[PDB]
Amino acid sequence: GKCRGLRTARKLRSHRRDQKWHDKQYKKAHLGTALKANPFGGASHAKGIVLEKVGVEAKQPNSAIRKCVRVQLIKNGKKITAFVPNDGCLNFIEENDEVLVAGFGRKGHAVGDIPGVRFKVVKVANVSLLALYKGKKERPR
Amino acid sequence: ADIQTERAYQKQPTIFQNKKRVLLGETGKEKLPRYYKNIGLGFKTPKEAIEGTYIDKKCPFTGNVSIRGRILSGVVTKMKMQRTIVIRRDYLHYIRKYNRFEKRHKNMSVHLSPCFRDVQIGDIVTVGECRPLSKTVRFNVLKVTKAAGTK
Amino acid sequence: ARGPKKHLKRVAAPKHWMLDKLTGVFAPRPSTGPHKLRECLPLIIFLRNRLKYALTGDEVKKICMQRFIKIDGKVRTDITYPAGFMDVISIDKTGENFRLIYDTKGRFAVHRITPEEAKYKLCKVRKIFVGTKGIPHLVTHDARTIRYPDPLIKVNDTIQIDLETGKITDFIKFDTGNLCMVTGGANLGRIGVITNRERHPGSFDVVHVKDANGNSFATRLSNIFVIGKGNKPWISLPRGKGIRLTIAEERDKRLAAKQSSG
RNA sequence: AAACUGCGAAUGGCUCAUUAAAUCAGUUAUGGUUCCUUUGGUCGCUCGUACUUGGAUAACUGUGGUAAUUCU
RNA sequence: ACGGGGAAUCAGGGUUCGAUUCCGGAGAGGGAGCCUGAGAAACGGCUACCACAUCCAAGGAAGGCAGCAGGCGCGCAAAUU
RNA sequence: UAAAGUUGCUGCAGUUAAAAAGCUCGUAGUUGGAUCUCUCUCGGCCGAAGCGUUUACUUUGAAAAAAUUAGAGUGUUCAAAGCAGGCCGCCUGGAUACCGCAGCUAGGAAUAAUGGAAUAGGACCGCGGUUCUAUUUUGUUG
RNA sequence: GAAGACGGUCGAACUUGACUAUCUAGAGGAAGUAAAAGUCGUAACAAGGUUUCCGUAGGUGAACCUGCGGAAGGAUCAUUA
């Protein structure tokens, strides 16, 4: 059982401090290895240069070729695989051009079918993918 | 005893001991009145301070120390320094989240005037705040209360 | 910081000035003078915010530089001159005299006094000391030094100063049973008879005071200003006689006054 | 106008790199210190050319140097 | 990691945040040393070194926007010379 | 941040879902059984009348920037706001509460700690006892 | 009363030999994870065809096998003077 004494505040506080490190979320947030290992470096978005276009096979229950791009982040130079969400949107991206990439929605975790992909392309050539998909804007020549 | 143990002469700066007195008018020693003051706040000057021969400029009673500020208490923990002791102040600090307390302590170095002869380890001392007397010392022992088990 | 500060932010100004928050970034930093920065009312606040004789600081300066404003019988042209407790402000052009006197809310009231009352002021003696080959000296809260005071005058007493000559004409001792105002703390601006003084050597003496309505409070001795011998003040008091109504009685009085009109 | 003299330029504004009982906050102390200014006091309290003393230097005039300066 | 007043959230309890207009501290590219002054180890003061950098007739001279605008760079990220 | 009683003080779990050390001793830490209902100034209504071992606790009282928060008043045209305003020169605001912890203060005395004499070095007190106060009651050490 | 010199002091910095972190157009080992939709077997789940598992030690192209001691989470809560 736990200590119930008027002068056990030190023991209770120290035990909570120690046992908080056994929480995955707390340790990830407060240890610093996750921020060092995070390609964005704690940022919500990041810019990169599209190194190439790749096709990732969906995980076994599903069958599809998810169109991603290998990009290299400008801020630090890391190589990232970023999903290109909608259909035909891979036709908007051209190799060796600027691209704004966000997280995939699960805070550094792969989403759905696409394995090992935790980033998605948000903008290409400083115009959003949603504007290109709907025809609101066009690629700058 | 041997008051003059330092390289410089030891004397109370306010007492003139070189007054001219004829030999035949001697009653006891020629002339050495002892300077002492009564510190405030109801504290009693120790008898050893009034009838002593020690020279201590940091003494609250016969020295050049004015007591003002906080009056604290502690238990004597160490007496391994010259005219200085280390006392321990124990207290309970409240942690609000757990609605509880924890034992904390602070060690305080206080000047011990030689007027308090026979001061042991573990007895209570009432100290008063003064000007900085050294790097770490800012309190002077004003009262000594013996420990409960001391016969 | 290096050296002294010269500005006062409007929000760091004393709250009893009743300055608003949108007029500017700065409040008029009181000049050095007889009264402390937080226990004074600058001349600009008095002539602009309280009396509405001026709309801006430029108009306050225009009034002051015509030498129309006297403080304690002397013309002052400094618009941030610190006027404090008991100080007499005379505007001879409009023929009006005021005495800076605290409200029961702790604010300096616009308290108009007769020209006969404007001839003198009460001063709480801050210290008594002997200097200059045995000459006794007295220092008041107003920071004026008086040589050769009465031998009976002690610290915490109240003297009466004739502003024309600036010498003591009367004095009240600090005794139990004497009327007093409170010049600081939670009870600032309250007037009552001193009941008892509990002494704490090496610390702050506490003085207990009883209102004219029977309410008892307590302050530090440094916040007590003896006003009159017995229960009779030696100065005029504001419309509220130092009796601090609770919020319920204030509400009731306001409602009664409102319902009496129309 | 200029220039000499006096005063301010140590305030304000910016930023958060440093900094882990350090800063800071509340609480006290300076009887262990300094304090321009403001305000009040003191300022024939000293037993020993005056109906006003001396030499400069700016500004100004004039001569200049350097590629170049709020140089001189 | 500037501290605090405080902010977000919150049944009770808490959790996180506080560079940011108020108060206190610190700094003025990095260190160091001073002059004047009541007050500065001041940088819209000086002296030197370190880094960067401006003009030059090559002898020398002059620097300090974490002030207000504004520019470059950085970046996901922030306005008028 | 809540949801997360998935960090649990309130308030979680540990047989088999993750989990009690192989087992004992043991210092610090934490927690510990009953018990105890004048006032050495006294003057013919007033004051030199005492934290009276102490602390923790509790209830006060001081003292504690403003802004923010809560909150009183106030038809910004409503509201976020603001600290204004209102009445035919006059009248009225610019409140108040809260402000952990530590420090100061004063009542209570349950609860909790602590103390009082057992080698009597014990409480009250009549009787004594070996240095020594610089005020002596009015022509000054005559 | 200037330049200047000596000696101190504060002391930036310089030369010199010694002690952290990351990008790699490089090597070089044994590892882990995912896709194994391929081979070699069959270790485990039924007494899984040698009951399984734990500690330890040794040996195997591999799951594994064997010795010693333990457990039932056993395939026996039981076996009779």
Q: Is B124 helix (H, G, I), strand (E, B) or coil?
A: strand
Name the residue among B87, B64, B71, B52 with its Cα closest to residue B13.
Answer: B64
Bridge partners of A80, per DSSP, are A71
The Cα B73–Cα B124 span in angstroms is 7
The size of chain A, in residues, is 141
Look up residue B129 and give its two tokens: 């705040």
Convert B112-124 into a string of H (helix), E (strand) and C (coil): CCCCCCCCCCCCE
Cβ C4 vs Cβ C22: under 8 Å: no
In the block, which residue shows the tokens 């200085």?
B84
Q: Could you name the CATH architecture of B1-151? A: Beta Barrel (2.40)
Q: Is C63 helix (H, G, I), strand (E, B) or coil?
A: helix
What is the CB neighbour count within 10 angstroms for residue A127?
16
Q: Å between A33 CA and G21 C1'?
A: 15
**Nearest-by-CA chain B residue for C201:** B41
Q: Give chain F positions with protein CB within 7 A.
A: 6-10, 12-14, 20, 29-32, 56, 61-68, 72, 82-84, 91-96, 100-106, 114-116, 119, 121
Contacts of residue C150, Cβ cutoff 8 Å, sequence gap at least 6:
C168, C171
Name the residue among C120, C204, C101 with its Cα closest to residue C167.
Answer: C120
Amino acid A126 reads N
Q: What is the CA radius of gyration of chain B?
A: 19
C53-65 as b/e: b if 16+ CB within 10 A: ebeeeeebbebbe
How close, in Å, is residue B71 to chain C by CA atoms? 10
Q: Is C85 helix (H, G, I), strand (E, B) or coil?
A: coil
Chains C and A touch (3+ CB pairs under 8 A): no
CA C112 to chain centre: 14
Cβ C157 vs Cβ C172: under 8 Å: yes
Q: Does A17 touch chain B (CB under 8 A)?
A: no
Bridge partners of C71, per DSSP, are C74, C89
Domain map (residue ranges) of chain C: 1-116, 121-171, 174-244
The Cα A119–Cα A109 span in angstroms is 9
H runs (alpha helix) in chain B: 47-50
Dihedral sign for Cα C253, C259, C260, C262, please.
positive
User: CATH assignment of C121-171?
Assistant: 2.40.50.740
The Cα A82–Cα A49 span in angstroms is 11
Q: Look at B68 and C202 and tell me if their CB atoms are within 8 Å.
A: yes
Q: Look at B98 and A6 and tell me if their CB atoms are within 8 Å.
A: no
Instruction: Look at the domain C1-116 and name its fold.
Output: 3.10.290
3-state helix, strand, coil in chain A (%, to 5): 25, 30, 50
Q: Look at A7 and B98 and tell me if their CB atoms are within 8 Å.
A: no
**Nearest-by-CA chain B residue for C204:** B69
Q: Is B62 helix (H, G, I), strand (E, B) or coil?
A: coil
In the block, which residue shows the tokens 């009312």?
C41
The Cα C217–Cα C228 span in angstroms is 18
The Cα B57–Cα B48 span in angstroms is 15
What secondary structure does DSSP assign to A58-119, as a single string?
PPTTS--EEEEEEEEETTT--EEEEE--STTGGGT--SS-EEEEEE-SSSS---TTSTT--E
Backbone angles phi, psi at C117, to 5 degrees: -70, -30
3-state helix, strand, coil in chain B (%, to 5): 5, 30, 65
Cβ C209 vs Cβ C219: under 8 Å: yes
Domain count, chain A: 1
Look up residue A37 and give its two tokens: 């290992």
Cβ B38 vs Cβ B45: under 8 Å: yes
Contacts of residue C77, Cβ cutoff 8 Å, sequence gap at least 6:
C64, C65, C67, C69
Look up residue C196 and give its two tokens: 């008892």
The approach used to solve this structure was cryo-EM
How close, in Å, is residue A29 to chain B by CA atoms? 22
Q: Look at C201 and B41 and tell me if their CB atoms are within 8 Å.
A: yes
**Angstrom distances, CA of residue C101 to CA of A106, C89, C104, C190:** 67, 11, 10, 11
B73-108 as b/e: b if 16+ CB within 10 A: ebbbeeeeeeebbbbeeeeeeeeeeeebbbeeeeeb
User: CATH assignment of C174-244?
Assistant: 2.30.30.30
Which residues constitute the domain of residue A81? 1-141
Contacts of residue A131, Cβ cutoff 8 Å, sequence gap at least 6:
A137
Cβ C171 vs Cβ C153: under 8 Å: yes
Q: What is the CA radius of gyration of chain A?
A: 21
